[PDB]
């Protein structure tokens, strides 16, 4: 209580580089949130209803390394900064929050669960401001309801002088609209 998180690193540099090139990933996948890496950058993805969602500005058009080889994106929406792959087997898929709570939590790549007040469809305010440096690399990270259902995924931070007062996210609604579209 309220909601807790911890992280487990599965790969190092060399293995990431190699896995990058082969497109083949034979490690077991576990957990609701995946830590993702390209050569240039690192960020997060959240599995919601069988799809692993992340941000375009992290993933680009790239495939995701998988047990059978590279997985092609199932959903690519550039204007909303959203992409998705079918979740690898073993990821714990979360469920959308329909209950309409405005009391949210953002899960950072550091496995902190931080309080957010929903201010609108795609926006929420950090109840306690954090340094920009603290949120970097957490895009694709989930925003949660108290029940632990997913409200959407972390997209961008609203910041001044390296301090972030709020966050922009991609609602599970946008995810559904992208799926019904494609």
């Amino acid at each position: 209580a309220p909601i807790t998180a911890y992280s487990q690193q599965t790969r190092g540099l060399l293995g990431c580089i190699i896995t990058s090139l082969t497109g083949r990933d034979k490690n077991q996948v576990d957990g609701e949130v995946q830590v993702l890496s390209t050569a240039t950058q690192s960020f997060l993805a959240t599995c919601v209803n069988g799809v692993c969602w992340t941000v375009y500005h992290g993933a680009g058009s790239k495939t995701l390394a998988g047990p059978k080889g590279p997985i092609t994106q199932m959903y690519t929406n550039v204007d909303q900064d959203l992409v998705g792959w079918p979740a690898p087997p073993g990821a714990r898929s979360m469920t959308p929050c329909t209950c309409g709570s405005s009391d949210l939590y953002l899960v950072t790549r550091h496995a902190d669960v931080i309080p957010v007040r929903r201010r609108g469809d795609s926006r929420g305010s950090l109840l306690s401001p954090r340094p920009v440096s603290y949120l970097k690399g957490s895009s694709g990270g989930p925003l949660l309801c108290p029940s632990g259902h997913v409200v959407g995924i972390f997209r961008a931070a609203v910041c001044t002088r390296g301090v972030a007062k709020a966050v922009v996210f991609i609602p599970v609604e946008s995810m559904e609209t992208t799926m019904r579209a494609s």
Binding site: Y6, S7, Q8
Partner: peptide
């Protein structure tokens, strides 16, 4: 310009 790679995960409770 390769694949995105899962390098870790996060477990919720």
């Amino acid at each position: 310009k390769g694949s995105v790679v899962i390098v870790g995960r996060i477990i919720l409770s």
